[PDB]
Design an enzyme around this catalytic site. Sequence first.
Site, PDB file in Angstrom:
ATOM      1  N   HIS A  48       0.821  -1.214   0.000  1.00  0.00           N
ATOM      2  CA  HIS A  48       0.000   0.000   0.000  1.00  0.00           C
ATOM      3  C   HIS A  48       0.861   1.273   0.000  1.00  0.00           C
ATOM      4  O   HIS A  48       0.335   2.379  -0.179  1.00  0.00           O
ATOM      5  CB  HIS A  48      -1.056  -0.011   1.110  1.00  0.00           C
ATOM      6  CG  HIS A  48      -0.552   0.405   2.456  1.00  0.00           C
ATOM      7  ND1 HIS A  48      -0.210  -0.505   3.437  1.00  0.00           N
ATOM      8  CD2 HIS A  48      -0.392   1.633   3.006  1.00  0.00           C
ATOM      9  CE1 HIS A  48       0.151   0.150   4.531  1.00  0.00           C
ATOM     10  NE2 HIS A  48       0.046   1.449   4.297  1.00  0.00           N
ATOM     11  N   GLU A  70      23.247   9.969   6.817  1.00  0.00           N
ATOM     12  CA  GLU A  70      22.291   9.585   5.778  1.00  0.00           C
ATOM     13  C   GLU A  70      22.935   9.043   4.507  1.00  0.00           C
ATOM     14  O   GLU A  70      24.038   9.457   4.117  1.00  0.00           O
ATOM     15  CB  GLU A  70      21.417  10.784   5.375  1.00  0.00           C
ATOM     16  CG  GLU A  70      20.546  11.341   6.487  1.00  0.00           C
ATOM     17  CD  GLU A  70      21.205  12.468   7.262  1.00  0.00           C
ATOM     18  OE1 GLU A  70      22.444  12.673   7.139  1.00  0.00           O
ATOM     19  OE2 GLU A  70      20.467  13.145   8.015  1.00  0.00           O
ATOM     20  N   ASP A  99       0.147  -7.641   1.710  1.00  0.00           N
ATOM     21  CA  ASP A  99       0.561  -6.231   1.725  1.00  0.00           C
ATOM     22  C   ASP A  99       2.075  -6.144   1.877  1.00  0.00           C
ATOM     23  O   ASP A  99       2.597  -5.812   2.940  1.00  0.00           O
ATOM     24  CB  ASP A  99      -0.169  -5.455   2.837  1.00  0.00           C
ATOM     25  CG  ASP A  99       0.042  -3.944   2.749  1.00  0.00           C
ATOM     26  OD1 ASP A  99       0.573  -3.466   1.725  1.00  0.00           O
ATOM     27  OD2 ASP A  99      -0.336  -3.232   3.722  1.00  0.00           O
ATOM     28  N   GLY A 114       1.685   6.831   8.568  1.00  0.00           N
ATOM     29  CA  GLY A 114       3.063   7.313   8.441  1.00  0.00           C
ATOM     30  C   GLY A 114       4.089   6.270   8.861  1.00  0.00           C
ATOM     31  O   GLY A 114       5.255   6.370   8.499  1.00  0.00           O
ATOM     32  N   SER A 133       3.419   3.136   8.126  1.00  0.00           N
ATOM     33  CA  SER A 133       3.143   2.165   7.053  1.00  0.00           C
ATOM     34  C   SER A 133       4.407   1.687   6.378  1.00  0.00           C
ATOM     35  O   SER A 133       5.245   2.504   6.010  1.00  0.00           O
ATOM     36  CB  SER A 133       2.290   2.822   5.967  1.00  0.00           C
ATOM     37  OG  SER A 133       0.959   2.982   6.398  1.00  0.00           O
ATOM     38  N   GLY A 134       4.515   0.373   6.185  1.00  0.00           N
ATOM     39  CA  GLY A 134       5.644  -0.211   5.474  1.00  0.00           C
ATOM     40  C   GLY A 134       6.858  -0.479   6.341  1.00  0.00           C
ATOM     41  O   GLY A 134       7.777  -1.176   5.914  1.00  0.00           O
TER      42      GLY A 134
HETATM   43  N1  LIG Z   1      -1.475   0.017  13.753  1.00  0.00           N
HETATM   44  C1  LIG Z   1      -2.426   0.841  13.288  1.00  0.00           C
HETATM   45  N2  LIG Z   1      -3.407   1.147  14.022  1.00  0.00           N
HETATM   46  C2  LIG Z   1      -2.321   1.395  11.895  1.00  0.00           C
HETATM   47  C3  LIG Z   1      -1.122   1.243  11.210  1.00  0.00           C
HETATM   48  C4  LIG Z   1      -0.971   1.741   9.922  1.00  0.00           C
HETATM   49  C5  LIG Z   1      -2.016   2.407   9.301  1.00  0.00           C
HETATM   50  C6  LIG Z   1      -1.775   2.904   7.927  1.00  0.00           C
HETATM   51  N3  LIG Z   1      -2.502   3.753   7.352  1.00  0.00           N
HETATM   52  O1  LIG Z   1      -2.176   4.146   6.089  1.00  0.00           O
HETATM   53  C7  LIG Z   1      -1.913   5.531   5.826  1.00  0.00           C
HETATM   54  C8  LIG Z   1      -0.424   5.842   5.724  1.00  0.00           C
HETATM   55  O2  LIG Z   1       0.370   5.504   6.588  1.00  0.00           O
HETATM   56  O3  LIG Z   1       0.051   6.506   4.669  1.00  0.00           O
HETATM   57  C9  LIG Z   1      -3.226   2.570   9.978  1.00  0.00           C
HETATM   58  C10 LIG Z   1      -3.384   2.060  11.279  1.00  0.00           C
HETATM   59 CA   LIG Z   2      18.250  13.353   8.591  1.00  0.00          CA
END
Ligand SMILES: N=C(N)c1ccc(/C=N/OCC(=O)O)cc1
Ligand SMILES: [Ca+2]
Length: 223
Positions: free
Chosen positions: A40, A62, A84, A175, A177-178
């Site tokens: 995603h 960096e 994912d 934020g 994510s990933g």
């Molecule tokens: N652990 C959670 N509650 C959780 C973790 C990750 C997300 C990701 N959202 O996507 C939007 C982005 O990051 O760009 C949501 C909830």
């Molecule tokens: Ca930096």
Amino acid sequence: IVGGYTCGANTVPYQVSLNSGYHFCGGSLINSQWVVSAAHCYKSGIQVRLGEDNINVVEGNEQFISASKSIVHPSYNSNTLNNDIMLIKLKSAASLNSRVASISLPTSCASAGTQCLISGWGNTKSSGTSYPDVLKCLKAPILSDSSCKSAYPGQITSNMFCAGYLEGGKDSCQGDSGGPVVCSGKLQGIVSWGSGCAQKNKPGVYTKVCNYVSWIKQTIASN
Ligand SMILES: N=C(N)c1ccc(/C=N/OCC(=O)O)cc1
Ligand SMILES: [Ca+2]
């Protein structure tokens, strides 16, 4: 990361920031030229930023390296978030050192109860928005599949696990994510989804990396 702590500069040496003009996702360095992130998180024009602590200040450790290619899992479903996972190749190999280091892939899946370290530059609030500039960390246990399925009826596949705290207050968030979930020095999870962040009975849901080791290795070997 909600309810976590400041990691300390370069204490999570496999943590990367994906940047397309701004940080938009985390990732995990798995060898000198490859990063694992969430499907995603896919977009074109990715620059991988290694050795980061404060993502808004150049602090001296960096490495900024553009991606040459991204490979989203062939079976990724963006509606259900099943599978994912995505691989990102760097245009040139990172220089590895104590502050920029790869993380091992698992040899077996981790069990419920295992303590893991989850990290990222995501939102630190469960209501409203505050983005930290420095890397945040959370120690959290993997939850049982039964408690995970009970929290999210009809949504947890065999390629997902829950980690965190059913009481709420401590979780990954937008934020993050990933980014990595590392347990006993192995990458076991990727920050994937959850209902809000740090909500009671809504723990974080993570991509189950141990299911993808064969795909990762074979993909890397041919790309
Ligand atoms: N652990 C959670 N509650 C959780 C973790 C990750 C997300 C990701 N959202 O996507 C939007 C982005 O990051 O760009 C949501 C909830
Ligand atoms: Ca930096």
